[PDB]
Write a protein that binds this ligand. Sequence first.
Ligand SMILES: [Co+2]
Ligand SMILES: [Co+2]
Ligand SMILES: [Co+2]
Ligand code: NA
Ligand code: NA
Lengths: 297, 305
Amino acid sequence: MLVTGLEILKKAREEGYGVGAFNVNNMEFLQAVLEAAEEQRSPVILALSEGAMKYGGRALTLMAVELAKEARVPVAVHLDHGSSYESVLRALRAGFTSVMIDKSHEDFETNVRETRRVVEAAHAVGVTVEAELGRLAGIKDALLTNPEEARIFMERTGADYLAVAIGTSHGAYKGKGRPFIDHARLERIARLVPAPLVLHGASAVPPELVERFRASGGEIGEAAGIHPEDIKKAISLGIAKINTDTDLRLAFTALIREALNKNPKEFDPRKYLGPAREAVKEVVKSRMELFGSVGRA
Amino acid sequence: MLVTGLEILKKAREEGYGVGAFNVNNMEFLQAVLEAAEEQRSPVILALSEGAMKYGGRALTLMAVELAKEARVPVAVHLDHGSSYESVLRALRAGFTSVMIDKSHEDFETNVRETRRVVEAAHAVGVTVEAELGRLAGIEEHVAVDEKDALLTNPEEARIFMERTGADYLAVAIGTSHGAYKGKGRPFIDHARLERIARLVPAPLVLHGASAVPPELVERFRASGGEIGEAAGIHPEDIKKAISLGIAKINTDTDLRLAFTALIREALNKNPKEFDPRKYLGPAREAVKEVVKSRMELFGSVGRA
Ligand SMILES: [Co+2]
Ligand SMILES: [Co+2]
Ligand SMILES: [Co+2]
Ligand code: NA
Ligand code: NA
């Protein structure tokens, strides 16, 4: 069933588990995410970036929303990283039930004002919103989320869930080796901010996947993602929404590569896109196992 | 907007042009075909085989039907080569506005029975149907005066078939590597036969197994690391004449798969560091669009919207 992001995230934090927000850009990623959710009888969030918005267009948003209503598990359709008020309006227009306005690279007052404006529009149409305080960077101090400012930010904006900067970042190159997650800071934030918390750039980028990618011909540096244990503890401390994108992309590209390397003569797209879709699905299922959302529907 | 296959194919034959029935299996292919249709101000038919119904499932049929309603050109959603009555039921269920049941590999009597059953179901829900007749049955008792004349479709038989089944449009065997005539000789179009068929069957005619498969496309495919045998497709002029003689629907699929696959290869061969699907699927989607636009051009449907 299609529900708001908060209905899912509030329940999650209260019950101590995490729900995955998986980015999708077309039909098979969307199918993999939803089937994984159905097989795990687990709530899920379909994340569509502004990029997915441009690439997938009406077809993608039509799928995300309508297929969500038919899902037998709770599903929310989330705008990931809305960069403006107008971008958010188009998500509201496309039937999304959750939207993120990212202005963390702006100063406090601007971030507050921009986010508050989004909150009012969204709340007027029953959509819940995610905002971000702090800049997702490698490794109070630095520009990692400040606990007291998080409380203030949330009270002033009225946002529904907060993305926090506690050590993560986007990409396949999180850090050289196991990236450090400020779990102490997470707890302080959680103590003052009762809203469910959000973790961006949380892909695992497991070594075997990077390995399977290189073997198919892919080329990538010394990639590395957040450690499973860090994610498990982050969740226990308040993280209710974990974003995953990179992992899905690697698995998908890998399988496509193996298929084309091995079968010259294959030009039926279902033959190489199908197994790539399956792999994405398996990853989503693992992630749900990790987040503890299995049987949570 | 969304309309029946007959509304589109009837207008096409009466006005002398063909409408492409482009097979789609996912989002990219569907977007490519609809945008092509829009930029060419041309009607188009979205075709989904049973492989597509299985692979694309509810997601594909949802997109096909809904995006069709929003198109500025007339669009029909069609079940390509159904193999059973229930298959047709699932398509009627999914909102299709044109269904096709293929029992041409069956004897004339079973084909009639099977087709008539689909027609009754479809017409009960406002959906038009395509039927297929290949081999010479022998109904009125006809003797093949040629090895081909025994595999291809007999005009007279075609009339009776349509008269008994009540189908809306008909696919006929006239020389393309498809069905009984498959791998049984060099692909061609028995225009004389087509003309005789059209004289006795006023309903729009359908052409299967006919793909241009231009050398430039195969070249690009082979260059991308792909391997394919000596493809043999119908010549542009033939298609243009077949249409002039009554062909109103032209199934197109192979050419799309080739272009789509070739571009994915080029992008992956050249950018091994790439793992963002949009980076290699997007240009692939465009290639498909271009192929679709040329076919519409060849078929004569530009500006017929
Ligand atoms: Co993020
Ligand atoms: Co972020
Ligand atoms: Co056929
Ligand atoms: Na987000
Ligand atoms: Na057909």
